């Protein structure tokens, strides 16, 4: 059977979790994707010559119980921690998302990529160096993305798969 990777995309409301997921899977940019909709999305990809299923939970942080969210938190093998480069609060939240992931896995060593999204915008209040330094502190990759232009989008998800593959070896 083809290897499957359950991935979880987390981060503050409005940072582009849905736009990144839909750009990765469907190759189009969404501007009005319901902020409250949480679902899993799948795509068969080839990463470094090995075919795998990306099985991605696009989180929406709503209260209602979900057997699916529990399954992806319990068995998910990697997290995308997304902030927006024009949203200081979303960057300040990253510490809290990483603490949530550590508690879920009871581990400091969970495969994780820091994603600075909306890098097409000029209004940059979180600089590259700040995010690079935080990712270095956490021992994780930092990828700059635009769900709008596609820059970094495959790189963010493929880098997370490479972190899982390195973790499992
Ligand atoms: C436009 C709506 C939207 O995108 N979101 C996503 C982010 N949301 C959210 C919020 C908020 N506000 C939140 O406070 N937490 C959270 C909770 C419930 C407890 C403790 N800390 C936090 C954050 C400050 C980190 C959210 N937590 C989670 C969450 C994560 N990230 C993980 Cl790894 C596991 C579990 Cl069981 C979680 F519940 C998520 Cl998905 C979203 C949170 C609000 C609406
Ligand atoms: N300019 C720009 N806008 C974006 C980008 N990613 C998301 N957006 C917009 O930001 C808003 C929130 O995005 P969404 O993906 O729904 O946020 P979510 O709450 O994290 O799922 C929408 O209007 C998106 O079109 C990006 O890379 N660049
Ligand atoms: Mg969304």
Curated annotation (Swiss-Prot):
Q: How is its activity regulated?
A: Alternates between an inactive form bound to GDP and an active form bound to GTP. Activated by a guanine nucleotide-exchange factor (GEF) and inactivated by a GTPase-activating protein (GAP). Interaction with SOS1 promotes exchange of bound GDP to GTP.
Q: How does it sit in the membrane?
A: Lipid-anchor
Please give the catalytic activity noted in the UniProt record: GTP + H2O = GDP + phosphate + H(+)
Alphabetical UniProt keywords: Acetylation, Cardiomyopathy, Cell membrane, Cytoplasm, Deafness, Disease variant, Ectodermal dysplasia, Glycoprotein, GTP-binding, Hydrolase, Intellectual disability, Isopeptide bond, Lipoprotein, Membrane, Methylation, Nucleotide-binding, Palmitate, Prenylation, Proto-oncogene, Ubl conjugation
Q: Which InterPro entries match?
A: P-loop_NTPase (IPR027417), Small_GTP-bd (IPR005225), Small_GTPase (IPR001806), Small_GTPase_Ras-type (IPR020849)
What GO cellular component is one of the record's annotations?
Answer: membrane
Which residues are modified to N-acetylmethionine? 2
Sites carrying a glycan are 36
List where the motif Effector region lies. Answer: 33-41
Q: What is the effect of changing residue 62 to H?
A: In lung carcinoma
Q: Which residues carry this modification: N-acetylthreonine?
A: 3
Q: What are its E.C. numbers?
A: 3.6.5.2
Could you confirm whether the keyword Cell division appears in this record? Answer: no
A Pfam family assignment: Ras
What does the PTM comment state?
Acetylation at Lys-105 prevents interaction with guanine nucleotide exchange factors (GEFs). Lysine-depalmitoylation by SIRT2 promotes its localization to endomembranes in endocytic pathways.
The organism's superkingdom is given as Eukaryota
Which disease is this protein implicated in? Leukemia, acute myelogenous: A subtype of acute leukemia, a cancer of the white blood cells. AML is a malignant disease of bone marrow characterized by maturational arrest of hematopoietic precursors at an early stage of development. Clonal expansion of myeloid blasts occurs in bone marrow, blood, and other tissue. Myelogenous leukemias develop from changes in cells that normally produce neutrophils, basophils, eosinophils and monocytes.
Q: Subunit structure of this entry?
A: Interacts with PHLPP. Interacts (active GTP-bound form preferentially) with RGS14. Interacts (when farnesylated) with PDE6D; this promotes dissociation from the cell membrane. Interacts with SOS1. Interacts (when farnesylated) with GPR31. Interacts with RAP1GDS1. Interacts (active GTP-bound form) with both SHOC2 and PP1c (all isoforms) to form a tertiary complex; SHOC2 and PP1c preferably bind M-Ras/MRAS, but they also bind K-Ras/KRAS, N-Ras/NRAS and H-Ras/HRAS. Interacts (GTP-bound form) with MAPKAP1/SIN1; inhibiting K-Ras/KRAS activity.
Function of this protein? Ras proteins bind GDP/GTP and possess intrinsic GTPase activity. Plays an important role in the regulation of cell proliferation. Plays a role in promoting oncogenic events by inducing transcriptional silencing of tumor suppressor genes (TSGs) in colorectal cancer (CRC) cells in a ZNF304-dependent manner.
What PANTHER family does the record tag this protein with? Answer: RAS, DI-RAS, AND RHEB FAMILY MEMBERS OF SMALL GTPASE SUPERFAMILY (PTHR24070)
What's the name of the protein?
Answer: GTPase KRas
Originating species:
Homo sapiens (Human)
Q: What is the lineage of its organism?
A: Eukaryota, Metazoa, Chordata, Craniata, Vertebrata
